[PDB]
Amino acid sequence: VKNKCVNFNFNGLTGTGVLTKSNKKFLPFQQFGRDIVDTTDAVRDPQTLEILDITPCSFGGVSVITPGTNTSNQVAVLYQGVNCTEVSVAIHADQLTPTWRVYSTGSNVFQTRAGCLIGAEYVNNSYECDIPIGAGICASYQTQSQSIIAYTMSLGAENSVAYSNNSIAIPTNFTISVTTEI
Amino acid sequence: VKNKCVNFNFNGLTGTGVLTKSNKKFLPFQQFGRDIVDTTDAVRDPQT
Amino acid sequence: LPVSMTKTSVDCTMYICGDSTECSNLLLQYGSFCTQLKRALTGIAVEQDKNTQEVFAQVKQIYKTPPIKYFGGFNFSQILPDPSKPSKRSPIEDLLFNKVTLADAGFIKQYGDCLGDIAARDLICAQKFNGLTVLPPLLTDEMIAQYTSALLAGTITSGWTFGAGPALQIPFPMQMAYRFNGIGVTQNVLYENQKLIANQFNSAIGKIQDSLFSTPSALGKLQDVVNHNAQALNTLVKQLSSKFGAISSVLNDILSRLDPPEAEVQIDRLITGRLQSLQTYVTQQLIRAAEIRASANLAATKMSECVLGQSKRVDFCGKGYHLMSFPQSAPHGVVFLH
Amino acid sequence: SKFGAISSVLNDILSRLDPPEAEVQIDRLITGRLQSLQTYVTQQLIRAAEIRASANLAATKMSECVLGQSKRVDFCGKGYHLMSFPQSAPHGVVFLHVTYVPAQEKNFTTAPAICHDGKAHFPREGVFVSNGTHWFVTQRNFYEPQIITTDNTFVSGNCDVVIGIVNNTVYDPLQLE
Amino acid sequence: LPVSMTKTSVDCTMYICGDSTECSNLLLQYGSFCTQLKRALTGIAVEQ
Amino acid sequence: VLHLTQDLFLPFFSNVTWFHAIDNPVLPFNDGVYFASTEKSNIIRGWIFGTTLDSKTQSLLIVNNATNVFIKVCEFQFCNDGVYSSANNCTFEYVSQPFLMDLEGKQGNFKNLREFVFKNIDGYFKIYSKHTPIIGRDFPQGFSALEPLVDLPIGINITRFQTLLALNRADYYVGYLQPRTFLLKYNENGTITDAVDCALDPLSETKCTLKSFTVEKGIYQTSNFRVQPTESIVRFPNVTNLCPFHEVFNATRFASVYAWNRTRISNCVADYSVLYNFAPFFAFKCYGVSPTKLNDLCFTNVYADSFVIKGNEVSQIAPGQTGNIADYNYKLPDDFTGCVIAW
Numbered sequence A: 001v002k003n004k005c006v007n008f009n010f011n012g013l014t015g016t017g018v019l020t021k022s023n024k025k026f027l028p029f030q031q032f033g034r035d036i037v038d039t040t041d042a043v044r045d046p047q048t049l050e051i052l053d054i055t056p057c058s059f060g061g062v063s064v065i066t067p068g069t070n071t072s073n074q075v076a077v078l079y080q081g082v083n084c085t086e087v088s089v090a091i092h093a094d095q096l097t098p099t100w101r102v103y104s105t106g107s108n109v110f111q112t113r114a115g116c117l118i119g120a121e122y123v124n125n126s127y128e129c130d131i132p133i134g135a136g137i138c139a140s141y142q143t144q145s146q147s148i149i150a151y152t153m154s155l156g157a158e159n160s161v162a163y164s165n166n167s168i169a170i171p172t173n174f175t176i177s178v179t180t181e182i
Numbered sequence B: 001v002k003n004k005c006v007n008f009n010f011n012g013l014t015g016t017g018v019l020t021k022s023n024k025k026f027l028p029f030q031q032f033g034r035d036i037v038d039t040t041d042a043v044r045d046p047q048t
Numbered sequence C: 001l002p003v004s005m006t007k008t009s010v011d012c013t014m015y016i017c018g019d020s021t022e023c024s025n026l027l028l029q030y031g032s033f034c035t036q037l038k039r040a041l042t043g044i045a046v047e048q049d050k051n052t053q054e055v056f057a058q059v060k061q062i063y064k065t066p067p068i069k070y071f072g073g074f075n076f077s078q079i080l081p082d083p084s085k086p087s088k089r090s091p092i093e094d095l096l097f098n099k100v101t102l103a104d105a106g107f108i109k110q111y112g113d114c115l116g117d118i119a120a121r122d123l124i125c126a127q128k129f130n131g132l133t134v135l136p137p138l139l140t141d142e143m144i145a146q147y148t149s150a151l152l153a154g155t156i157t158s159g160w161t162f163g164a165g166p167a168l169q170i171p172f173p174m175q176m177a178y179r180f181n182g183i184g185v186t187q188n189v190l191y192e193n194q195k196l197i198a199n200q201f202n203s204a205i206g207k208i209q210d211s212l213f214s215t216p217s218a219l220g221k222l223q224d225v226v227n228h229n230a231q232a233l234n235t236l237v238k239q240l241s242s243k244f245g246a247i248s249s250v251l252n253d254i255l256s257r258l259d260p261p262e263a264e265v266q267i268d269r270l271i272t273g274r275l276q277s278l279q280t281y282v283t284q285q286l287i288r289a290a291e292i293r294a295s296a297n298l299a300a301t302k303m304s305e306c307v308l309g310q311s312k313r314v315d316f317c318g319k320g321y322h323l324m325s326f327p328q329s330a331p332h333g334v335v336f337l338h
Numbered sequence D: 001s002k003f004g005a006i007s008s009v010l011n012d013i014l015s016r017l018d019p020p021e022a023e024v025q026i027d028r029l030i031t032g033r034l035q036s037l038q039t040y041v042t043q044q045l046i047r048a049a050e051i052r053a054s055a056n057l058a059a060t061k062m063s064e065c066v067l068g069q070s071k072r073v074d075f076c077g078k079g080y081h082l083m084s085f086p087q088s089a090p091h092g093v094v095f096l097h098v099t100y101v102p103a104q105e106k107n108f109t110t111a112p113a114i115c116h117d118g119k120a121h122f123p124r125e126g127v128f129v130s131n132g133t134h135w136f137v138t139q140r141n142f143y144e145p146q147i148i149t150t151d152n153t154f155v156s157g158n159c160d161v162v163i164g165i166v167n168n169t170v171y172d173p174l175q176l177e
Numbered sequence E: 001l002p003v004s005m006t007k008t009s010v011d012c013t014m015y016i017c018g019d020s021t022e023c024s025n026l027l028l029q030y031g032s033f034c035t036q037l038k039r040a041l042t043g044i045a046v047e048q
Numbered sequence F: 001v002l003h004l005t006q007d008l009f010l011p012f013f014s015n016v017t018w019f020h021a022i023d024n025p026v027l028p029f030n031d032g033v034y035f036a037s038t039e040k041s042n043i044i045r046g047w048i049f050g051t052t053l054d055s056k057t058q059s060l061l062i063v064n065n066a067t068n069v070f071i072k073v074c075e076f077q078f079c080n081d082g083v084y085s086s087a088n089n090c091t092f093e094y095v096s097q098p099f100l101m102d103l104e105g106k107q108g109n110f111k112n113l114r115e116f117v118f119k120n121i122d123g124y125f126k127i128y129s130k131h132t133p134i135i136g137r138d139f140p141q142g143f144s145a146l147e148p149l150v151d152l153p154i155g156i157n158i159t160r161f162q163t164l165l166a167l168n169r170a171d172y173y174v175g176y177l178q179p180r181t182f183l184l185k186y187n188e189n190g191t192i193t194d195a196v197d198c199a200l201d202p203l204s205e206t207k208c209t210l211k212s213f214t215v216e217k218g219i220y221q222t223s224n225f226r227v228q229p230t231e232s233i234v235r236f237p238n239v240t241n242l243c244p245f246h247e248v249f250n251a252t253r254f255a256s257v258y259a260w261n262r263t264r265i266s267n268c269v270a271d272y273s274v275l276y277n278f279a280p281f282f283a284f285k286c287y288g289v290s291p292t293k294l295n296d297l298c299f300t301n302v303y304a305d306s307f308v309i310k311g312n313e314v315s316q317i318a319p320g321q322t323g324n325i326a327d328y329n330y331k332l333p334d335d336f337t338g339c340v341i342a343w
């Protein structure tokens, strides 16, 4: 059972993960495999003499982005650093350790460089950050009629100066602003 | 003896402290009692 | 000047007790000993994000350079972003990116090719295997360069006025003459030797690129920071193979040799060894995060003084009498061209 | 937290186990609680070092912005700093940075210098600004145009090396009298 | 204003196991737990 | 206080099989059952639990009456409907205050609702109850605490769930609990005004992480997510050696009792499939080692003595036996642990 998470107990070596064909150069005497930090990575097949790689099971992490509870009960789920077709097929096969399930309507799926956001919909408009999502994304509660929307950062108001060889802007007036620092 | 610092061994629960009549709401099946952080705070009198 | 490092969100259960119900139950007997670790690492990540925000988002308006580039003969194509480059970064930031190699990018979603790694899996796949993960920075490396570009446009088209209030356009020779006036020399010396000043500026701007290219490591601070995080993670994942004075370092093996009634002592031994190792890692990360916060606050002060203005303090904005400082985005850090 | 022992209550474990078997669980609780206290004091030392850095920054800010005017731009609040009031806060300080921020501005014109008679006149303190027809000199941070007098400028040059110079007349209070 | 302190180069094998072969062998079972410590102290001296 | 607990609880917003009464389906009892019933005055008398519901395994009946209860952990024979029939091997007769509170405000519209949740972890059957003449439409929505009534350490095995009825001349709510972590809000008077699950909704999970009932705007790291393995493959070296079991069970001159003809077993593999499929067999008695839970045992040496005897001697070969073959030719030790083969 390659390309699928499965517990393995190869000739006394027990663990979990995903296996597939490899182009290793295992020497004939070699039986186990490892890496720089002494973590098992490859195991020779004791019945086929083939080499199979070892994978982490699906490691990521769930973060819940929510506004104030007094505002709404709507929430969106973030899964860090996993491909979102992968998490979708995991949900379809019903093998994800989480039991809580947020609806996948097709519109609420956003493969983001920090893992895909589910429960929020991408808007191509840019607004100031409200809840930091990561990778230049922030989610917020906005009116359409109310839902959670994920968007790229609005770095600020786009402004173009009028620099020239002989152009100067001089303030003919002034304002006094009492800022606060804590 | 209440309002005094005494060593108590109430029903196997040993410890040192001061006891006084309280205004808690122990349900007839409640015996030990506690506070916010998981420590014996108020033990109802099994006799009176 | 480093500004941040790789954000980490180390988890308790998978790292210490690999998918073992009895081991997780025994760890639950330790209370909220590791929820402290999770909260500390989350706070570290938040602090690093705030560090980036403070050190870069000093201007509320994204300024744009004029389409023409003739700033009184001063050549700025080396530090202004190159439109042809897809990343829209100047050659200086391009060299900075090419001279810095990240062990862990983080924003890769490497899961999926770890099975396809074929060869011995790298630190990323190993750390995903043994309970280690890396979060990506909130501000992407593209928009960080965008902030740098806006700051550069402001500081080369409006002087230091945009650092105080509205951006007031002013010719670059006039701005340099006023920097001269602020450094105790009248504008006439500049206005008589504008050609010489421009030529010297162009020569220095050309030569700093070659110095960065040919030097062994002028990115020593950032490279040391990245190497420190990578080495800390490597030691963290190496501690899993330590016996810690028990029968074996394999959680399945210790169970498959001693029945848990007599194996709970070794389970507790592994628990406390890994807990102390993670405690050391988290404390060292907290110390390095405090040091990085100090460095990034220094960098933000340097920005707010030397970039959005001229600082009368000496040495602060480079050796000699300070005139300007043009920032350049760097991996997990900033670079000032004083 | 039981810390892998019989119970988390010292008195109960003492009253339920003899000394020469209970001392093992006693040592287990000792080391668990002691590692917890070490973690707490280490984190408190981190927090105290960070708070000490913040308090040193606050003291420097108070000394400069409060007891004087700081030329360091963007240090005592955004904009040109003028003065600041410190205000007491619970376990903290709050500053009221009073800052001078410019306002409505106009493009006029600019030249590096003025050439009256074969000589380049540079402004003493200010810009060379032009209404559009008549050249003027005014301060950098406020539009206060004034007639270009010799007192308003200083002359050094030969009207052939200052790039971008323009032609205008400078006046003096001496030639009239 | 303090500028630096005395530089320290604490040694794991000696401090934790006075010239004992079995003790050093047991300490080796704790992994590279103290190599981090030696590197940290070296970095501290370099920082001073 | 917002104390957090991990205990077998009925999942919130789970599925409950509401029933009626006008024949007594056998509801399975796994990880306990949550029961409820709404009635005008009474239609319910007692429950039955256990396995196979006969006088073979100890079971439980929790019937009540007008003034008290008649709960008894007995092994009653059968009723299939004076209900009980057998009280021979039965103990644990318990009588206390009745389980039904019945009250009315001068009208029958005050339909009382009763709520009973059960579990038998390490025995100790638990009955938690709270009675309220609630609005009476159906299984309501407003939260309510659940006070214990009795706690009895049964110490028996229970697997099923049925119920008795009443006589005459809308109830039976059934729920299943699952191992979940719960958070409980404790009032200043000690009551439980609210409670939130920790594995149902992401908002509930984050609320459980920070032990609160209010969550501010932001992002919270709650837990991790893993893909549990679908299968569990075990692989071992293609195939190893074989002991001459076939060679010792397929000879031609098996020596009789006067030459016990033993083939010592070492460095072999204990493949006992041949021991099963070989011959129709006539005596397969095993004394010290199970004849099926033995391939999981590794031995240092094994001794197999091949004999030829008659039918009576086949049964005669046994520990602590006498006769012409058990005392004069081959004696079987009393402390012998092993198996015998006769075909």
Ligand SMILES: *[C@@H]1O[C@H](CO)[C@@H](O[C@@H]2O[C@H](CO)[C@@H](O)[C@H](O)[C@@H]2O)[C@H](O)[C@H]1NC(C)=O
Binding pocket: A172, A173, A174, A175
């Ligand atoms: C500079 O800006 C001031 C406000 O920031 C102006 O003051 C205003 O004056 C009007 C009356 O004309 C008031 O109604 C208003 O409340 C405010 O005080 C001031 O006029 C302006 N000066 C110039 C020269 O533009």
Ligand SMILES: *[C@@H]1O[C@H](CO)[C@@H](O[C@@H]2O[C@H](CO)[C@@H](O)[C@H](O)[C@@H]2O)[C@H](O)[C@H]1NC(C)=O
Binding pocket: C075, C076, C077, C078
């Ligand atoms: C500003 O400085 C640039 C340095 O990169 C100049 O680009 C150069 O272009 C020439 C060919 O035109 C190349 O040979 C050289 O390697 C470099 O790329 C740029 O011309 C210059 N512009 C001005 C106006 O001085």
Ligand SMILES: *[C@@H]1O[C@H](CO)[C@@H](O[C@@H]2O[C@H](CO)[C@@H](O)[C@H](O)[C@@H]2O)[C@H](O)[C@H]1NC(C)=O
Binding pocket: D131, D132, D133, D134
């Ligand atoms: C150039 O600067 C002149 C200042 O002397 C402005 O001229 C003024 O015009 C008024 C009449 O509108 C006269 O009464 C006054 O004495 C003065 O000469 C002039 O407006 C200004 N030009 C521009 C384009 O702003």
Ligand SMILES: *[C@@H]1O[C@H](CO)[C@@H](O[C@@H]2O[C@H](CO)[C@@H](O)[C@H](O)[C@@H]2O)[C@H](O)[C@H]1NC(C)=O
Binding pocket: D165, D166, D167
């Ligand atoms: C400013 O005024 C000068 C005389 O008042 C001008 O100098 C003259 O320039 C002409 C050529 O344009 C020469 O032929 C003549 O001999 C004299 O040098 C000067 O050009 C003028 N400049 C501008 C920008 O108006």
Ligand SMILES: *[C@@H]1O[C@H](CO)[C@@H](O[C@@H]2O[C@H](CO)[C@@H](O)[C@H](O)[C@@H]2O)[C@H](O)[C@H]1NC(C)=O
Binding pocket: F187, F188, F189
């Ligand atoms: C805890 O129990 C107290 C004793 O009954 C309650 O106090 C009572 O409150 C009622 C009003 O609800 C008063 O009329 C009465 O005089 C007495 O003060 C108290 O409310 C209760 N707390 C709760 C239910 O939260």
Ligand SMILES: *[C@@H]1O[C@H](CO)[C@@H](O)[C@H](O)[C@H]1NC(C)=O
Binding pocket: A047, A048, A049, F238, F239
């Ligand atoms: C494993 O054993 C089977 C059974 O005889 C055989 O068909 C197969 O070829 C063997 N494979 C290897 C790699 O030895």
Ligand SMILES: *[C@@H]1O[C@H](CO)[C@@H](O)[C@H](O)[C@H]1NC(C)=O
Binding pocket: A083, A084, A085, A086, A111, C108, C109, C112
């Ligand atoms: C992950 O991202 C998408 C979605 O699954 C797909 O291209 C592929 O699975 C992965 N690609 C890369 C570049 O990792």
Ligand SMILES: *[C@@H]1O[C@H](CO)[C@@H](O)[C@H](O)[C@H]1NC(C)=O
Binding pocket: A122, A123, A124
């Ligand atoms: C609107 O969003 C879609 C997808 O998010 C994008 O392809 C499109 O370019 C956006 N439109 C504009 C005008 O940016």
Ligand SMILES: *[C@@H]1O[C@H](CO)[C@@H](O)[C@H](O)[C@H]1NC(C)=O
Binding pocket: A163, A164, A165, A166, C068, C070
């Ligand atoms: C500035 O002057 C240069 C050369 O005289 C010219 O190429 C450029 O177009 C001018 N720009 C403006 C804005 O006048």
Ligand SMILES: *[C@@H]1O[C@H](CO)[C@@H](O)[C@H](O)[C@H]1NC(C)=O
Binding pocket: B046, B047, B048
């Ligand atoms: C004796 O025990 C009974 C049982 O509750 C009760 O009356 C009381 O605890 C004792 N009587 C006294 C102390 O007079």
Ligand SMILES: *[C@@H]1O[C@H](CO)[C@@H](O)[C@H](O)[C@H]1NC(C)=O
Binding pocket: A162, A169, D105, D106, D107
């Ligand atoms: C300066 O001129 C430019 C040219 O279009 C204009 O856009 C800008 O608004 C002007 N600045 C002012 C009026 O302050």
Ligand SMILES: *[C@@H]1O[C@H](CO)[C@@H](O)[C@H](O)[C@H]1NC(C)=O
Binding pocket: F013, F014, F015
């Ligand atoms: C309860 O069962 C019905 C079908 O009998 C199903 O449609 C529904 O989704 C179930 N509810 C839950 C919460 O699983």
Ligand SMILES: *[C@@H]1O[C@H](CO)[C@@H](O)[C@H](O)[C@H]1NC(C)=O
Binding pocket: F065, F066, F067, F068, F069, F070, F095
């Ligand atoms: C009800 O059960 C109790 C319990 O023993 C018994 O004493 C009583 O006689 C029974 N009948 C009535 C009418 O109470």
Ligand SMILES: *[C@@H]1O[C@H](CO)[C@@H](O)[C@H](O)[C@H]1NC(C)=O
Binding pocket: F055, F056, F075, F088, F089
């Ligand atoms: C009671 O149950 C025990 C348990 O098996 C059984 O041995 C005994 O014969 C039973 N007595 C009866 C049914 O009278």
Ligand SMILES: *[C@@H]1O[C@H](CO)[C@@H](O)[C@H](O)[C@H]1NC(C)=O
Binding pocket: F250
């Ligand atoms: C004994 O072996 C022969 C050939 O090796 C075989 O034909 C015969 O069936 C075997 N005897 C039994 C009882 O299986």
